[PDB]
């Protein structure tokens with residue numbers, strides 16, 4: 001079968017055949033679409049078909065499908081699976097798997113970069129201190145004095161699910177949040193639960209509005225341990241506005257390196273439960289979501305006050321006015337400090353080019369419109385007008401439950 | 412199978428049981444989600460009639476009553492005999508209101524029960540259709556205190572006698588391809604503007620020419636009619652801060668009235684059913700004015716604002732966009748024409764959703780269409796999970812008539 005997607009701004013029509021290689025479920029049925037739902041242990045039984053499929057993909061990409069190396073590798077993985085119940089990826093396969101998990105991430109607007117990913121093999125790690133050292137080197141390499149470089153560090157794969165490697169942080173760099181007795185929140189409200197865990201584990205919290213959280217690292221299913229990222233490795237950007245000199249007095253900053261650390265990387269049926277990856281920000285992640293979500297820092301009111309907008313009626317669009325100015329300030333500050341950032345116009349335009357290229361060279365590009373379209377100015381970016389097919393390919397990044405809900409504490 | 416939807420801004424969780432009553436299909440499968448795709452006989456009819464009558468008599472608390480069974484019997488006998496059937500006035504009103512209630516892409520549905528239904532099923536000619544449409548337009552406009560309305564022309568019979576309004580909206584601006592290569596007026600309507608000229612219209616070739624009506628009764632050739640200008644309420648667009656904004660020469664019309672959809676009630680098909688409500692500001696300010704394939708005025712507004720259009724990262728488009736949408740709301744409000752900003756309308760829809768989940772067990776909703784095309788995440792609907800499914804009675808798309816008309 002062939003499926004067509006249409007861009008309703010340009011009338012470009014693209015034909016998807018890649019969806020035929022989709023295995024996992026979407027959550028939708030013929031009778032209900034779960035397209036806007038946020039969130040829609042493995043034996044030798046199912047593992048070799050998952051392995052074989054990945055290895056067929058791998059050897060096809062290197063133009064070696066059917067070769068002796070291909071057949072021998074399948075043979076080697078088969079015996080290793082029956083002998084040991086799992087298998088180990090070659091370095092080349094790990095690199096390929098990690099790049100394609102990013103390439104397959106249908107919610108990621110930044111995938112034009114998928115092939116320039118620095119893969120750090122951390123599968124020889126055994127302890128939380130070792131994890132901290134790998135993560136520090138990741139942070140230093142990826143930050144690169146503001147000239148950000150995409151990187152992923154891959155810790156040992158799951159075995160029996162009782163010895164998991166986990167980074168308990170959702171992101172490697174993230175600000176603490178503190179629930180005050182009066183009900184207000186100091187810092188990032190999205191991080192209150194994790195902040196409280198860190199404090200319980202012995203973190204001495206500064207209790208400021210932009211405290212970089214400690215790393216909480218779990219090696220081999222042991223209880224997690226706390227580590228402070230060297231501050232010299234944490235690049236931060238004070239937020240000022242190019243016209244509004246009072247904007248700096250809001251006291252805002254953000255960190256430069258977005259590094260997701262709580263997802264699971266699936267490659268050939270293997271599960272990498274600790275695989276922190278990082279790229280660079282699209283401005284709206286900070287300016288729109290982090291700063292202006294009602295349940296995040298929520299600065300719209302105070303910004304709109306300082307701008308002296310008509311805040312009595314929503315139809316003055318005072319929220320939309322402030323939102324743009326905040327987002328100008330984020331992009332201005334990062335560029336002024338020469339820290340890599342991309343605005344939503346550039347990023348969406350690149351994604352369209354990437355997506356068209358993928359359809360031509362690959363037969364498709366799974367894309368989740370709900371997530372691709374930026375959270376401001378949606379229809380003046382070209383992704384808004386682009387029809388997209390969402391389906392799940394492997395290798396893939398998957399969600400996993402927060403470890404404090406599953407972890408069996410040693411004491 | 413009893414599904415939950417979470418609002419991630421408020422953690423409010425709603426349980427959806429209404430989706431199990433869904434009938435038609437979404438276009439999605441377990442292998443592929445098509446959520447962002449724009450457009451995915453006597454034996455067929457009586458189950459459709461029975462399903463609708465069942466929900467109707469349940470809605471009036473007479474399910475399983477003699478009146479229910481008799482009507483089921485009566486319609487059953489009518490389909491057996493005439494191969495179709497006719498809705499009582501009460502069922503037609505209920506069916507139309509519920510087609511709006513079920514429009515999963517409509518953010519305005521909190522108003523669904525206050526719909527004025529104009530029964531036009533006695534209409535036989537395009538002139539008669541014109542008369543019904545002028546009355547609709549005048550009633551709905553109401554001197555700018557807009558009121559929701561639908562006018563329902565006779566139902567499809569053998570598909571050769573279809574009633575169709577060829578316009579996509581009762582009121583829309585013409586589009587002309589210039590010899591110069593550009594487009595004057597609304598580019599979205601260039602093709603329809605051609606068919607009006609091809610059928611005899613005398614185009615003023617302006618930037619905001621109200622298109623004439625192209626009305627088709629009983630499958631005959633469509634006929635041109637000019638809506639009385641005194642019935643077409645328009646709002647000149649000025650900014651409450653930029654005096655130069657008036658010189659852009661922008662106006663829009665007050666009455667959004669979709670005329671090309673198909674209303675399905677109890678298996679019956681109403682191919683001509685223009686309905687109207689009132690605008691959300693962003694439809695005009697974001698889509699009509701700022702889409703690249705439409706009036707596409709961002710450049711000119713940004714220039715007048717003297718924004719730095721050298722780099723996208725100055726967010727000059729975003730700044731201009733906000734101001735254009737401030738002007739649209741300000742202009743409609745100042746002229747006392749009903750309009751709703753995207754903040755109010757999405758807040759109302761959240762309240763509507765909660766109302767529907769409480770009193771109905773669900774609300775089918777299409778996130779891709781419900782979230783406004785600007786400032787998405789600062790509106791509550793962005794953080795609202797939504798289940799999309801197809802309920803009937805429903806509004807449906809249909810082929811453009813010129814592609815089908817046996818001339």
Ligand code: HEM
Nearest residue numbers: 102105107108109110113150152277278279280281282397
């Ligand atoms: C290099 C620059 C990058 C940019 C500009 C970018 C942009 C984005 C944005 C804006 C989102 C939406 C996230 C949100 O709203 O919270 C996203 C999602 C995502 N990104 Fe990228 N990204 C980049 C790099 C990467 C890399 C290096 C990876 C992995 C190796 C990655 C994997 C993902 C995944 C898996 C998601 C979806 C998360 C989910 O499924 O919920 N991205 N990306």
Ligand code: HEM
Nearest residue numbers: 511514516517518519522559561686687688689690691806
């Ligand atoms: C009264 C105020 C109303 C408001 C503010 C409103 C708002 C909207 C908006 C913004 C859209 C997206 C349309 C687009 O972007 O082109 C929409 C879609 C829609 N509206 Fe409403 N609407 C209203 C009244 C009505 C009425 C009275 C009906 C029918 C009786 C209706 C039926 C629909 C349908 C069927 C769609 C989706 C069409 C599709 O499936 O693609 N609306 N509405």
Ligand SMILES: Cc1cc(N)nc(CCc2c(F)ccc(CCCN(C)C)c2F)c1
Nearest residue numbers: 038110258259260277278279280281282285
């Ligand atoms: C690598 C990278 C680049 C970039 N531009 N931004 C980020 C942070 C955003 C982001 C992702 F991308 C991917 C995943 C998550 C976690 C999702 C959290 N959700 C469910 C509330 C994320 F929060 C990371």
Ligand SMILES: Cc1cc(N)nc(CCc2c(F)ccc(CCCN(C)C)c2F)c1
Nearest residue numbers: 449519667668669686687688689690691694
């Ligand atoms: C009754 C009403 C209220 C309001 N606020 N706006 C409108 C016009 C938008 C609109 C709809 F709502 C419903 C349907 C269409 C047609 C769809 C056009 N698509 C496919 C480009 C529409 F274009 C109509």
Ligand SMILES: C[C@H](O)[C@H](O)[C@H]1CNc2nc(N)[nH]c(=O)c2N1
Nearest residue numbers: 036037038370371793794795796
């Ligand atoms: C309910 C809805 O699915 C949820 O709010 C989604 C919408 N789209 C998004 N898109 C991005 N990029 N990031 C998000 O967190 C979300 N949230």
Ligand SMILES: C[C@H](O)[C@H](O)[C@H]1CNc2nc(N)[nH]c(=O)c2N1
Nearest residue numbers: 384385386387447448449779780
């Ligand atoms: C491709 C995509 O489905 C298309 O651009 C949609 C997106 N969401 C929309 N939402 C609304 N309200 N109106 C639209 O026309 C569209 N267009």
Ligand SMILES: [Zn+2]
Nearest residue numbers: 028033439444
């Ligand atoms: Zn779907």
